[PDB]
Amino acid sequence: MISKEYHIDEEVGFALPNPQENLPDFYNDWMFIAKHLPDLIESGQLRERVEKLNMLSIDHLTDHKSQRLARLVLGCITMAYVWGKGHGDVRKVLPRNIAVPYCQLSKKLELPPILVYADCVLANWKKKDPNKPLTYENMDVLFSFRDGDCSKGFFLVSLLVEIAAASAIKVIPTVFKAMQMQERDTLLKALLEIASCLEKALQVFHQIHDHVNPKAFFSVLRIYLSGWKGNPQLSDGLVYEGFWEDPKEFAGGSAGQSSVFQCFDVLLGIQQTAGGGHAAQFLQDMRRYMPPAHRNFLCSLESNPSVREFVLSKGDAGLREAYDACVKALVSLRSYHLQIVTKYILIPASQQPGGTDLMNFLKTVRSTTEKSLLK
Numbered sequence: 264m265i266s267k268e269y270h271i272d273e274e275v276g277f278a279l280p281n282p283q284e285n286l287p288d289f290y291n292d293w294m295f296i297a298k299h300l301p302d303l304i305e306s307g308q309l310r311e312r313v314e315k316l317n318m319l320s321i322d323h324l325t326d327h328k329s330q331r332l333a334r335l336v337l338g339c340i341t342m343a344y345v346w347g348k349g350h351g352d353v354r355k356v357l358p359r360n361i362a363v364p365y366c367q368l369s370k371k372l373e374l375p376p377i378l379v380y381a382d383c384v385l386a387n388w389k390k391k392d393p394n395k396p397l398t399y400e401n402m403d404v405l406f407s408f409r410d411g412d413c414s415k416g417f418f419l420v421s422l423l424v425e426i427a428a429a430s431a432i433k434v435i436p437t438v439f440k441a442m443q444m445q446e447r448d449t450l451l452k453a454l455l456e457i458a459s460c461l462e463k464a465l466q467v468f469h470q471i472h473d474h475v476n477p478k479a480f481f482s483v484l485r486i487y488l489s490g491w492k493g494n495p496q497l498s499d500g501l502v503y504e505g506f507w508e509d510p511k512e513f514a515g516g517s518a519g520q521s522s523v524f525q526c527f528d529v530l531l532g533i534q535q536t537a538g539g540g541h542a543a544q545f546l547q548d549m550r551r552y553m554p555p556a557h558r559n560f561l562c563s564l565e566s567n568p569s570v571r572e573f574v575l576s577k578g579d580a581g582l583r584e585a586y587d588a589c590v591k592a593l594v595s596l597r598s599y600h601l602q603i604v605t606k607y608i609l610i611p612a613s614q615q616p617g618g619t620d621l622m623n624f625l626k627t628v629r630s631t632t633e634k635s636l637l638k
């Protein structure tokens with residue numbers, strides 16, 4: 264069984280299980296804004312509310328989950344204050360009232376003060392009826408940016424795929440032991456179970472199409488998931504008033520912050536972070552934007568001896584086809600993602616009178632995965 268000190272749930276994997284929906288009543292003022300970003304934005308009174316808050320303390324955030332719930336709240340608020348209505352009227356300074364508690368709550372959690380995927384996907388969800396299983400119709404998110412930003416779709420579908428991969432994560436310890444103990448039949452069985460679980464994860468990703476439409480994602484939701492690294496409209500980054508003196512640059516959320524988007528490449532000995540290509544560095548950098556425990560899990564995989572070198576050594580066609588199945592499944596997940604980015608960005612972007620740096624990254628990530636095959 265996997266170590267609980269990495270905070271992987273036998274059931275939900277890298278998602279946070281049964282996330283806190285409510286902060287202690289001390290924090291009712293934060294909760295009210297995050298619950299109503301749509302309304303407060305469209306009114307034009309979102310910045311008014313934030314600027315009129317008191318500097319609350321983080322010291323009443325006790326349990327890990329209430330701390331994770333706060334970080335999701337402040338991170339939604341921060342993106343709303345910075346980006347506004349999403350049409351270019353931008354704030355370059357985050358008020359102490361909010362920047363200070365946020366930067367504190369982050370340092371405690373080892374995360375940066377910007378909304379990351381482990382916020383708005385892994386900790387942003389509830390099951391309506393506890394007894395029923397984790398299907399979309401039984402699920403909701405906790406927070407959103409504008410009406411019809413399709414944020415429910417993009418986050419829950421992401422999350423479901425994360426859950427679909429939990430099944431595969433479960434097996435990783437079975438692999439490394441079979442190598443350590445030289446149990447070949449057992450290793451093959453495992454690689455096949457893992458491959459099946461990613462074929463499953465692909466069918467879940469297909470659900471994307473029912474719950475997101477192109478116009479809304481390109482023009483709206485993309486705006487609120489943008490950060491301030493290499494961004495022209497915030498050339499130097501964000502001032503976190505009262506916590507840091509200078510403005511700091513921080514990246515927008517991306518699929519690259521998903522552990523699952525990394526853990527299997529690493530398991531299979533695909534050197535995504537070596538060699539140093541633009542894409543290679545970007546995946547290494549986003550590891551620092553993951554929960555500390557989850558960054559630790561990936562790093563300790565690089566520490567175990569290579570699954571690729573072992574399979575290559577044995578001259579065993581069954582192990583090769585089995586290893587190939589896991590690699591081919593990942594190629595499917597990258598190819599489907601390429602299809603999604605076409606439908607959801609590049610086409611819309613061609614209708615408004617960055618966009619493509621993302622495609623290169625995935626053509627590279629895919630080409631590096633396809634070249635990691637044997638037969």
Ligand SMILES: C[C@@H](C(=O)Nc1ccc(C#N)cc1)[C@H]1CC[C@@H](c2ccnc3ccccc32)CC1
Nearest residue numbers: 380421424488516517518521523524596597600
């Ligand atoms: C929809 C997609 C996403 O971008 N979510 C997402 C949601 C919110 C933010 C933010 N702020 C950023 C990102 C998710 C994550 C990637 C995943 C996937 C694709 C390709 N290759 C894979 C390989 C192994 C496992 C999963 C893979 C598909 C599901």
